[PDB]
Design a protein around this ligand. Structure first.
Ligand SMILES: Cc1cc2nc3c(=O)[nH]c(=O)nc-3n(C[C@H](O)[C@H](O)[C@H](O)COP(=O)(O)O)c2cc1C
Ligand SMILES: Cc1cc2nc3c(=O)[nH]c(=O)nc-3n(C[C@H](O)[C@H](O)[C@H](O)COP(=O)(O)O)c2cc1C
Ligand SMILES: [Fe+3]
Ligand SMILES: [Fe+3]
Ligand SMILES: [Fe+3]
Ligand SMILES: [Fe+3]
Lengths: 403, 403
């Protein structure tokens, strides 16, 4: 099969795979992604940093063969596993069948992970590594740095001292499938928005660890030496500081003035309420997004919550409880824990036909999710003009509060 | 406009609307529904029991005009509203305008709900009814029976006793849109399964109030006459004891031997677990259903739950929580309160890669939802052969418990 490797420095090649067709990656929507694997070529040997999703071996392999072609090398000598997740380890056993001599390099925890996933790796040689440990390839040294919970217990970064490339696994990744491999080669909106989404859905609960890990990279004195950041998804950062600055901002809760309005509805009244709240917030010169849970994915919603100082979540009440779709978002938000960056303000609202109770349940679940809920707007059936005025007011107050 | 009315008894005609297009009625999936209005004509006056969704007046009005020409009467003399909900009250403004003399007949609570929906009816003549009240039509008499929380606070039945016909509104309804009007005129599998899904999604939490309502009609000496049930959705029950006996089974929790397996997954490990649980259930000769939350609607899932003695719920853990899709089903289950029919047995399972926590949360939330849930199957990453043997055993044991 014909697929070319892409040279990113002297002796360092991208040799991953392009997944044009992926549209839904475990409850995360996208327009394709890539699985980035990299081949590092020293004097004495070559290392393969990560691999790809199962079934994609032929493509990965064509690319490494092409890169072994150009450097005049014979084989992969070392297989590095930054991370155990399926999309980066999925062809590890094909790799081990193709290069029988090559040890697998990973953290002590990852070896349990890897043996659980693919038991046929029972008599593979595993070299355990921890922070500080080095792999010398000849004029090229690989330094390992353990990153537990960023984003899994098993994970680590590999650093290549001479080229200043940080191989970061999921960290700094973005889900985008372009023919261009570098950050500077595509629209920056598209780049930064995919990066933002990745952060909102995957890094948000890790935010404090993100910050501390920045310090520990600084304390070891490794930030000066970082000239390129090569994650396992999406674009390679030829401007590492662009994304580090963005991650720092997201982790410390920066945000411009913005209210995210989220709702569901059966008969429209809560929709009417949602609209008036949006108008109110709009009156204060604040940015305003409106989401409907019947239509909109939670990964797209959460991407805006990240850049929002406040939200308004509304739903009608059915048999004492909120409309169930709201239960999906709130469970997700209880995992993501936005309070770890910023305790965002929240308005809770809805229409109801009797005793109600949707606003009560949403309050509790918003609190446990780390939102500060002040006031609610509860309407009996279709809101009158004056009731829609009160939603306008609530919308405006919420916005003024975060100005 | 040409739309003909249907004689269902002497002086009694269906005059509803056929909604072929509806596919989604507030999170309830269907292949069309109907809005049944009934024209009831005595020797002195004519009553119109209920109406239809907003914007569908010309269709309803066409049918009521056919029924009028057919039966030889001039216009509608009384407007009857059993339910305030807009699929049955959506053209009441256009009926009050078309018949500016015809009083609106509803309960006390309905009036507040109907004025809030349509502020225009402020200067309309309301004729407030309660249980035992009669509207004499000249030879035919209507008897009004209140049914609060059955389905709504403002709900009521209208009866015809010298004729034994129950106008039950949402009760005994089914979301079907068929050219045929009667229960007997369409396959009973289709009929009953419709009626099943309608009970499961709409009547379940009302179960105990359905048995007491049967006790009350029997105490007032009215049900041992029953010839026909005429609901506001779907087929007219010419065999009313079939749906009344089914409703009795559903409210007391009768069920055949059946387990329902429900799960979500990201990488397929929880899926391998669900399939093994199902195999185990199957080894006991019990009926089995298997739903994935990524694909399947909550109204379909719940329909099978109604006919199941036991369920299994599985999900991988994601940031210390179960897969978010679970939160939607659990919040919906929490409102349906299946424990008012039968405390069903439950099995909680799922794969994880660290500390877990999903199955602890599901065990907790399912018990809140009225299920009796002992035992979780928790697997680290990909389940081994023995771990799937263990899942098989869990499903078998769940299955044997309900035999
Ligand atoms: C399935 C069904 C059950 C309901 N149960 C309740 C309830 O328990 N308590 C309540 O206050 N309203 C209940 N409602 C009434 C609605 O909450 C009310 O009509 C509300 O205004 C709907 O707002 P929406 O237009 O945004 O859908 C129920 C409505 C339906 C459709
Ligand atoms: C987004 C992400 C976050 C995760 N967070 C946790 C965690 O909180 N705790 C844990 O035990 N596992 C966590 N997991 C690991 C999954 O539970 C594990 O990979 C599991 O095998 C998935 O099961 P499945 O194959 O059925 O999707 C996480 C996985 C992903 C991809
Ligand atoms: Fe990952
Ligand atoms: Fe990844
Ligand atoms: Fe209704
Ligand atoms: Fe209805």
């Amino acid at each position: 099969m014909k697929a070319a490797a892409k040279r990113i420095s002297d002796g360092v090649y991208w040799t991953g795979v392009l997944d044009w067709d992926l549209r839904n990656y475990h409850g995360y929507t996208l327009q394709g992604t890539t699985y980035n694997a990299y081949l590092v070529c020293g004097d004495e040997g070559v290392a393969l940093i990560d691999n790809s999703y199962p079934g994609t071996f032929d493509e990965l392999m064509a690319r490494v063969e092409d890169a072994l072609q150009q450097v005049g090398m014979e084989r992969v000598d070392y297989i590095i596993q930054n991370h155990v997740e399926k999309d980066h380890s999925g062809v590890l056993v094909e790799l081990h069948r193709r290069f029988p001599e090559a040890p697998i390099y990973c953290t002590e925890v990852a070896v349990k992970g890897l043996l659980k996933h693919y038991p046929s790796l029972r008599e593979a040689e595993f070299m355990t590594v921890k922070t500080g440990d080095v792999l010398d390839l000849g004029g090229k040294t690989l330094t390992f740095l353990e990153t537990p919970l960023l984003h899994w217990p098993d994970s680590m970064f590999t650093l290549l001292d001479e080229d200043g490339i940080l191989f970061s696994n999921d960290a700094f990744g973005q889900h985008l499938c372009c023919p261009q491999r570098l950050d500077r080669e595509i629209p920056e909106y598209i780049l930064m928005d995919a990066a933002r989404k990745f952060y909102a859905n995957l890094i948000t609960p890790l935010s404090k660890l993100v910050l501390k890990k920045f310090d520990e990279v600084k304390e070891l004195g490794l930030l000066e030496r970082i000239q390129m950041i090569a994650p396992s998804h999406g674009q390679i950062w030829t401007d590492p500081m662009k994304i580090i600055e963005a991650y720092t901002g997201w982790a410390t809760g920066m945000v411009d003035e913005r209210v995210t309005v989220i709702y569901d509805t059966m008969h429209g009244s809560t929709r009417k309420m949602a609209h008036a709240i949006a108008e109110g917030a709009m009156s204060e010169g604040v940015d305003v997004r409106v989401y409907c849970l019947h239509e909109d994915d939670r990964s797209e919603i959460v991407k805006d919550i990240l850049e929002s100082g406040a939200i308004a979540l509304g739903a009608p009440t059915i048999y004492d409880e909120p409309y169930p779709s709201v239960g999906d978002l709130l469970m997700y938000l209880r995992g993501l824990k936005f309070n770890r960056t910023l305790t965002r303000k929240a308005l809770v609202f809805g229409s109801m036909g009797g005793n109600g109770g949707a606003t009560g349940t949403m309050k509790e679940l918003l609190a446990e999710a780390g939102f500060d809920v002040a006031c609610e707007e509860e309407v009996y059936y279709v809101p009158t003009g004056d009731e829609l005025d009160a939603c306008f007011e609530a919308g405006r107050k919420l916005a003024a509060e975060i100005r």
